[PDB]
Amino acid sequence: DLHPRDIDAFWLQRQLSRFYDDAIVSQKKADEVLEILKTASDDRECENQLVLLLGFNTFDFIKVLRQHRMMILYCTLLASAQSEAEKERIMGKMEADPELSKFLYQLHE
Amino acid sequence: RRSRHCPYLDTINRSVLDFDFEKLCSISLSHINAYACLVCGKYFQGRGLKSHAYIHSVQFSHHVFLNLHTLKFYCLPDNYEIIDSSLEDITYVLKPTFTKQQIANLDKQAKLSRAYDGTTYLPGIVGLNNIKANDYANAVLQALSNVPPLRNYFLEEDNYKNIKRPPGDIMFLLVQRFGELMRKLWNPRNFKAHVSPHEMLQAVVLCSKKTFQITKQGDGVDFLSWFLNALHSALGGTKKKKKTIVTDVFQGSMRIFTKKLPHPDLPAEEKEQLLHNDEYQETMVESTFMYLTLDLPTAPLYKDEKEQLIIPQVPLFNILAKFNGITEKEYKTYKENFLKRFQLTKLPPYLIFCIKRFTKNNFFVEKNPTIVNFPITNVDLREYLSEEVQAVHKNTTYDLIANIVHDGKPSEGSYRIHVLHHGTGKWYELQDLQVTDILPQMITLSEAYIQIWKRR
Numbered sequence: 001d002l003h004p005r006d007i008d009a010f011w012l013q014r015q016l017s018r019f020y021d022d023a024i025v026s027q028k029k030a031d032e033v034l035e036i037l038k039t040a041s042d043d044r045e046c047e048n049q050l051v052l053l054l055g056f057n058t059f060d061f062i063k064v065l066r067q068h069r070m071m072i073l074y075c076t077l078l079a080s081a082q083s084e085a086e087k088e089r090i091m092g093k094m095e096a097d098p099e100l101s102k103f104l105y106q107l108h109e
Numbered sequence: 110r111r112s113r114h115c116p117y118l119d120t121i122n123r124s125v126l127d128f129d130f131e132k133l134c135s136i137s138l139s140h141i142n143a144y145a146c147l148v149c150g151k152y153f154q155g156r157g158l159k160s161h162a163y164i165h166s167v168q169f170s171h172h173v174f175l176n177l178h179t180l181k182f183y184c185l186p187d188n189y190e191i192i193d194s195s196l197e198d199i200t201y202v203l204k205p206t207f208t209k210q211q212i213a214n215l216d217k218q219a220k221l222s223r224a225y226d227g228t229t230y231l232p233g234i235v236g237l238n239n240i241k242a243n244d245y246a247n248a249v250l251q252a253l254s255n256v257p258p259l260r261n262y263f264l265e266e267d268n269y270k271n272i273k274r275p276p277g278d279i280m281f282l283l284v285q286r287f288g289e290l291m292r293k294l295w296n297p298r299n300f301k302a303h304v305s306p307h308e309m310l311q312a313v314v315l316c317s318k319k320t321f322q323i324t325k326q327g328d329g330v331d332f333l334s335w336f337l338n339a340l341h342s343a344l345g346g347t348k349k350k351k352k353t354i355v356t357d358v359f360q361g362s363m364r365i366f367t368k369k370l371p372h373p374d375l376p377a378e379e380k381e382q383l384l385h386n387d388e389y390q391e392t393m394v395e396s397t398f399m400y401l402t403l404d405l406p407t408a409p410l411y412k413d414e415k416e417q418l419i420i421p422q423v424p425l426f427n428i429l430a431k432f433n434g435i436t437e438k439e440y441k442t443y444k445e446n447f448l449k450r451f452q453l454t455k456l457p458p459y460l461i462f463c464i465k466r467f468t469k470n471n472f473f474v475e476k477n478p479t480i481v482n483f484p485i486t487n488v489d490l491r492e493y494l495s496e497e498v499q500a501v502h503k504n505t506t507y508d509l510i511a512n513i514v515h516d517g518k519p520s521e522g523s524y525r526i527h528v529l530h531h532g533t534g535k536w537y538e539l540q541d542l543q544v545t546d547i548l549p550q551m552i553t554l555s556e557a558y559i560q561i562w563k564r565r
Contacts, residue, residue: 008195009193009195010118010119010121013116013119014119017119017120023116023117023119023120026116026119027114027119030119080195081195082113082193082194083194108220
């Protein structure tokens, strides 16, 4: 269960580090995965994009994306918010979204 | 330059970081220029090449270290300080700092503070690990930390950092270590759900001359008295400033209108001679009663028609009425019958009462099991105060804030604390490391030993 409080700021890179041992390469791949997860168009098209990012194998990444696509992106953006402005923006756009609102309510409760 | 883009920061193990014990290096065993590892868990020394930290980072691949004094996260192998605000939790847990307003919103504790681990909790209701027989000291510390005066005073390092203590004094550690424990026990975002009293208990053991150590348990009343005296003598600095935080928050004034008896084996004339020659005179010796030792009556050691339970109950009002002016008490001094009588001149804001439920028999040391039927909602000592200044004390409606009960046999006994938490109304009972919920009616059931009441 990918709980709202489960994902941390570095959790996206940490999970992505199971397959990539090179920290710099792992960080670059995690940032690319985030940039693909955000600004997403189609389930299969973004799945193919994630395949191009992290190989045809390692289907666990695609499974995690299917289980948490908006959840992962929103949690990573909010947790990795450098200052109060980014946190305010993320929480504001998560208040409008129903799933994100429930995610935040569970996270703070 | 390399900050804000550190890849190694994604490997910090928040679960293993425990900054409660002493802040020393792994190999160096030096307290200077320490730098704990945010991945390897342990703490090393140095912050650069040819230092223990760089070697430990290179060898163990743990490439993230934070300085315990500079409070900065740096990549020790690369000597490039990192900059990520998402890591502020580690700094907050290491150095808990309470804001000017956050140190006064302790009564507005609505949401439960969930630790970084998988355990929701509430600040203040936290357990101190029972390192060997540290139960008495842990209970006394967890009860003294409940009082908002002392907690607020110790939550601001500025209130004690500039204290002018002698350079060659070790007692200043007690005023310094207790502050760290109080700050950690009130951390709203602590990494763990409990704080280890190891540092504070070790300091208490060192600053007490082999008394009240962590190995052998001690008396809770004696430990509380010693800690209060040490805090009062440590809060003041380079002067006889009796107006300490502890002396102002938990010490009051009692006027003992005490007297003495002439002789039991003398006739009327010889007794009256001493009664008139000021040899059996009544005098006022008013002192500062930091703790009011309300003595419980010995168990009758005999059953009766009533009292289906064979535990002799006793009302708090009758117990506390002894300190009143009318109630006279006798002291069996050497070659004298010191028949005295006390009177509370002034009540402290947070009265601390410690019922001496344990005595010494002619061949052993028994513990009186009489219960103290003390209402824990409202009570007034104006019915036992001194008649001279009865109307001077505007507020007298005191309510019990924390009770520490020493259950079990005298030799092998457990020390449990039943504390009435603020913010909410639940009077939680805390074990050494277990936090439970106690019904208010059940609080007045367990035989209390030390009680602290807030005068409101």
